[PDB]
Design a protein around this ligand. Structure first.
Ligand SMILES: CCCCCCCC/C=C/CCCCCCCC(=O)OC[C@@H](O)COP(=O)(O)O
Lengths: 56, 339, 218, 290
């Protein structure tokens, strides 16, 4: 009974102390990586029919 | 009376955890990345339809080759298709007709599946001179096998309805590692690019990040009001999206350790059955019980298309490792490729 | 393009094979066995002859696949829809446990599970065959214990036929789709060896009624 | 040895039929009742067709046969409409070609209707005896027998349109269809009769099977009602006309020119009733109507 709560607290205290970063920096890195690879995405930019094996 | 006082110690730990999560909330993605206007509307047309299943399709998964895929049907069959020539390359009859997951073993040589049998069946596709035969059967899970993904050619990560995950070694056949901490049925799992961490979503409305080597839980993410049916990693590897039965997707960031953004439309109120990203991560596709799949702009949470070619519940959705197309499978016994 | 066209026929072969399997899979009855653990379903499975157990048996040029999922121990809401389309649901209930409690009397738990399964949104046109097991045990038990332990509103003598019919009705009342499905009840007999015959008759009735419904005859 | 020079006047003079110089009370009566039955037929069959092609629930072989029967009955209604505005005094202006065309249209429409009834019966008999629950259905046999139905109808309506006519046999000419011959009347009557008795036997076997395999476990009352009314509509609509044809071909000096138009009106009322007899039971079809 108490052992369950003890293990849960021990595992949660590791989550308590964690390398937290500002949401601003996380969003900036997300946007940077998303716009850097924007060219290599076929779905983002519909490609013509001869370049896709599914067209013909 | 130490149990309740430790419960309140956890209460205070959560109080200061929420305080720190708010302290790091300097701004929001919506305020920051608004300078870039919407990317525009996307429209993808069904370029193929794979027939042959005589019952509901419950799962699929793409191979790293970007040409072959696998699907499991309630009729008791596991079919490996080729999406180019739409020719059924393999058709495996299973011992138990009740299957719910698939996996293609990026090595390209093995496949796996499982379900109400509580077993993970591994099928080898070498077939020197005989038809495909069950190569191994991993037993030990006490609940149905909800998801499974080959971490390597000899290791496999499995999620079960018994509220735990397990890393198995195929050769020996025992649970090399066990992952506990979820209080509900683990419904989905997703591996990271490097294979050093993986995120699992369960019916307890929670997603947990797990270290494969260490075996512990690093961070816990919450915010969903109901069961998480699907989960996918962001291509960069520092974020992940979760789809739930509360008609909503949610993008969480690892480093931030908090809910980054949400994707929900007042028009859609059904459950989400699958989620995926595009190779660039901008587009977030989500399969729904509405018989259709919705596209979202990850950075701004704006619908940017819809896929409608199925007459029944869209059960599985996937995007190839090249991002050239998308595969959808539904209970109507048919699959479809888009773009 | 020498062998790129060869594999095609192989593919086609697979295809045709699938079809045949489908046909065979369509020529067999599908029954889902449900119960509250100690409902006496073991006796039924025996008289017909971890994970999910399958029992095949033939009778009068007909075939039956019975699926027992009693060893799951998980939230049923996630996998129950997997049985949408079975020919019937055989639901077992032990009459003896009307008085013994697991708190909660096992009969109330059985009625709750029955209400959940019958009125489930995935089982709206599937018929239920109710098997009330432990006939003689329950009969000899009520000779000293009233039926008022489970249902406090019952009124009458404490004998086998009356209380048996009372429990039959109490289980049949939980149905709400009174126009879409039926409930074939049968108190399991030990030495008569006719339970498989009752299942055969119920499945035949269900099949014929669905046939008449397919066309404009019902 | 045939005559294709003289017009309808000579043929009607051969037998006892009259040309109806100009309008008459009976003429207006028959025209009105005919156009009424035709309006009813067309409206009901159009309603049935739009209901079947609007809701997707009605996308199965039995509903395909029901829609085919609706189309056949609509065709018969329009054929009876075209028959009006040309009979009575207008018939005097018709010629041999147009006469044969009109009669062949009538014959082919009604034969298609009868064949569709028989095919519905056959598919019901087939479906009632399968020992499967779902039985995923295809589109092969339904369209096969549908094209066979329309082929039988077209051939039975065209045979007399080319060679099987009493033009070449002045001695043996009908008394209701002056140009047709008694042999064709006998053929059509025997066809109708055998089709009806076959339907009767099929539905009786269905009922016996259901009775035997349901007694051990109400369906019997509803099945008996459906079968008895389905057969009764057909019999009470077609028996007088078949009797009239048989009397014409068999009994000479039998007064048959009096009860021909009314018996035709009844035969068409059969198609008027067909759409509701095969669609009133399905409450979904009724709900779809709006
Ligand atoms: C008597 C009821 C017969 C019902 C026949 C159903 C269709 C099968 C027809 C087989 C050929 C024999 C039909 C003989 C009756 C004629 C039916 C008909 O369509 O002709 C209309 C006729 O009055 C018009 O006469 P006029 O007004 O003098 O031109």
């Amino acid at each position: 009974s108490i052992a369950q709560a003890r293990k849960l607290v021990e595992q949660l205290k590791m989550e308590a102390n964690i390398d937290r970063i500002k949401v601003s920096k996380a969003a900036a890195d997300l946007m940077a990586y998303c716009e850097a690879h924007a060219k290599e995405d076929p779905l983002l930019t519909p490609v013509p029919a001869s370049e896709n094996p599914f067209r013909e | 009376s130490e149990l309740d006082q430790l419960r309140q110690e956890a209460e205070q730990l959560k109080n200061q955890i929420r305080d720190a999560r708010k302290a790091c909330a300097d701004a929001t993605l919506s305020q920051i990345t608004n300078n870039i206007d919407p990317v525009g509307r996307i429209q993808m047309r069904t370029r193929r339809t794979l027939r042959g299943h005589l019952a509901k399709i419950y799962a699929m998964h793409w191979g790293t080759d970007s040409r072959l895929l696998v699907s499991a049907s309630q009729d008791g069959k596991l079919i490996i298709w080729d999406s180019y020539t739409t020719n059924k390359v393999h058709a495996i009859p299973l011992r138990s007709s009740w299957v719910m997951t698939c996996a293609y073993a990026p090595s390209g040589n093995y496949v796996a599946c499982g379900g109400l049998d509580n077993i993970c069946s591994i099928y080898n596709l070498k077939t020197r001179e005989g038809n495909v035969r069950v190569s191994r059967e991993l037993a030990g899970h006490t609940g149905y096998l909800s998801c499974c993904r080959f971490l390597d050619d000899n290791q496999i990560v499995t999620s079960s309805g018994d509220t735990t995950c397990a890393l198995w070694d195929i050769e020996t056949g025992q649970q090399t590692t066990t992952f506990t901490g979820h209080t509900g049925d683990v419904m989905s799992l997703s591996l990271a690019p490097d294979t050093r961490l993986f995120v699992s979503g369960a019916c307890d409305a929670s997603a947990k990040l797990w270290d494969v080597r260490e075996g512990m839980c690093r961070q816990t993410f919450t915010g969903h009001e109901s069961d998480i049916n699907a989960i996918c990693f962001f291509p960069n590897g520092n974020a992940f999206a979760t789809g739930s039965d509360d008609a909503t997707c949610r993008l969480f960031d690892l480093r931030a350790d908090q809910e980054l953004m949400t994707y929900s439309h007042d028009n859609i109120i059904c459950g989400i059955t699958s989620v995926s990203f595009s190779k660039s991560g901008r587009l977030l596709l989500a399969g729904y019980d509405d018989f259709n799949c919705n596209v979202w702009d990850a950075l701004k949470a704006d619908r940017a298309g819809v896929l409608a070619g199925h007459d029944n519940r869209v059960s599985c959705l996937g995007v190839t490792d090249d991002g050239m197309a998308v595969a959808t499978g539904s209970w109507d016994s048919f699959l479809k490729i888009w773009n | 393009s020498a062998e790129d066209k060869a594999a095609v026929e192989r593919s086609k072969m697979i295809d045709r094979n699938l079809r045949e399997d489908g046909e065979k899979a369509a020529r067999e009855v599908k029954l889902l066995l449900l119960g509250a653990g100690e409902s006496g379903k073991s006796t039924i499975v025996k008289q017909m002859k971890t994970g999910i157990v399958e029992t095949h048996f033939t009778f009068k040029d007909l075939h039956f696949k019975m699926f027992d999922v009693g060893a799951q121990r998980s939230e049923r809401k996630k996998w129950i829809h997997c049985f949408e389309g079975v020919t019937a649901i055989i639901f077992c209930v032990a009459l003896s446990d009307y008085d013994l409690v697991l708190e909660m009397n096992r009969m109330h738990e059985s009625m709750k599970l029955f209400d959940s399964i019958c009125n489930n949104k995935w089982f709206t046109d599937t018929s239920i065959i109710l098997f009330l097991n432990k006939k003689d045990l329950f009969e000899e038990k009520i000779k000293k214990s009233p039926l008022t332990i489970c249902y406090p509103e019952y009124a009458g003598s404490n004998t086998y036929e009356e209380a048996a019919a009372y429990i039959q009705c109490q289980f049949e009342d939980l149905n709400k789709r009174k126009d879409t499905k039926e409930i074939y009840t049968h108190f399991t007999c030990a030495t008569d060896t006719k339970n498989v015959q009752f299942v055969f008759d119920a499945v035949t009735d269900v099949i014929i009624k669905n046939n008449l419904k397919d066309c404009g005859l019902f | 040895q045939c005559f294709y020079n003289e017009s309808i006047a000579f043929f009607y003079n051969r037998s006892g039929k009259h040309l109806a110089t100009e309008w008459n009370t009976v003429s207006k009566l028959v025209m009105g009742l005919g156009i009424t039955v035709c309006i009813f037929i067309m409206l009901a069959n159009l309603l049935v067709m739009v209901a079947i092609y609007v809701n997707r629930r009605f996308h199965f072989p039995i509903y395909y046969l029901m829609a085919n029967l609706a189309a056949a009955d609509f065709f018969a209604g329009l054929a009876y409409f075209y028959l009006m505005f040309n009979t009575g005094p207008n018939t005097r202006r018709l010629t041999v070609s147009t006469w044969l065309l009109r009669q062949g249209l009538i014959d082919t429409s009604l034969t298609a209707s009868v064949a569709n009834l028989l095919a519905i019966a056959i598919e019901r008999h087939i479906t009632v005896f399968r020992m499967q629950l779902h039985t995923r259905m295809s589109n092969r046999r339904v369209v096969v027998v549908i094209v066979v139905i329309w082929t039988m109808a077209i051939v039975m309506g065209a045979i007399p349109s080319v060679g099987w006519n009493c033009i070449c046999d002045i001695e043996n000419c009908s008394n209701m269809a002056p140009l047709y011959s008694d042999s064709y009347l006998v053929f059509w009557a025997i066809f109708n009769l055998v089709t009806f008795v076959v339907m009767v036997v099929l539905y009786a076997h269905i009922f016996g099977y259901v009775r035997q395999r349901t007694m051990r476990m109400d369906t019997m009352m509803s099945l008996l009602k459906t079968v008895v009314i389905v057969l009764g509509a057909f019999i009470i609509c077609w028996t007088p006309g078949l009797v009239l044809l048989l009397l014409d071909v068999c009994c000479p000096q039998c007064d048959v020119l009096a009860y021909e138009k009314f018996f035709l009106l009844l035969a068409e009322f059969n198609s008027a009733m067909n759409p509701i007899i095969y669609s009133y039971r399905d409450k979904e079809m009724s709900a779809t109507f709006r």
